[PDB]
Amino acid sequence: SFWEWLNAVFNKVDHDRIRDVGPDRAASEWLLRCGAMVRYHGQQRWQKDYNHLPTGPLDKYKIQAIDATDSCIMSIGFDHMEGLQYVEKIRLCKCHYIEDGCLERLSQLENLQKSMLEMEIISCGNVTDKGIIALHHFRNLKYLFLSDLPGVKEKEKIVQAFKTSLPSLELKLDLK
Template sequence: MASGIRLLQKVSRVTSQWNRTGHKILSRDADPCFIQRRHFLGWLNSVFNKVDDDRIKEVGPDRAAAEWLLRCGASVRWKGFNHIEKDYNSLPGGSFDRYKIEEIDASGSCIMFIGFPHLNGLNHVTKVILHECIYLEDNALEYLSYIKETLKVLQISRCPNITKDGLSKLVVLENLQQLVLFQLPEVIDKEETKHMLQNALPKCQVQFLENKKEKSQEENT
């Protein structure tokens, strides 16, 4: 299991680098062996993102969500702790109720929409970074409503499949204080999208920094 996780994270980092340099991930003329590897990777991603209801009942939503995120190459910070949890094999044992997720950084991870129901039951998440999530699609963003009561800061950047329709699902995040967006190539009318979000979320500072070479918030802190 651990070796499979490390392999997936390594391949995810490589494909993310290809995206940043503008190379095609897959084309009709691609090598057949490469296509097979892509199909295998897609299957492996689905396995790692799958929601296990029995596991959630056994260990609670925060622990189960942390396992999902770290399997996929993301990281979390527990409420009351400064340490960033990145290693699946280093997840704390003992009383699971002690550990509540406060921050999620999914930069460069392979999270997919089928894993987002893991957010249900998380009551302490204040910050989420979705940066270079190449498998992230619009339908995942509606699941952020599970954490709308506590979510204060959200960044969505360099996610090539996110469109205006997906961003429109963020209007339910009524307690959001800061929304940072940049390098979302499928969002065509960026100014209109920004105004739509700002009007729907008047208490939130909405930033669309498409023309700037911004790093993720995690890199800037």
């Protein structure tokens, strides 16, 4: 359908664009066009309007935090994450297209394994235990908040899994 194509082209990576403006700017464009927000290292305020992203010096601004609420990000859109070196916080809230494969793709990016400190996954109805358990590759994670994930059926197993793989993790669960 047209809507499938439209979501796909919102997500598709343009590698020319990454070459021209660098990974952080290209990912910022992807996130904001898809209804997410980003916040750069050294800045208090969030980027929430695509047209107000900085034009500024080339590749200066580095994403620290991502807040994708009510966003159409999915699957291969996360390939925009590949070049980012300094992402510490990700919130995925009411991201109706996210699935386990998105979380798997993120978990395999060594750049994110090195930098990630905090993640929050809220009201993303497709996510299951499999996608959550993939997050154990974020070896530096200190905070994980899971909420309203009806597909996560075995929350006790998740707690024990993380107890072993990430003993220092503060795991906050608001799960049925």
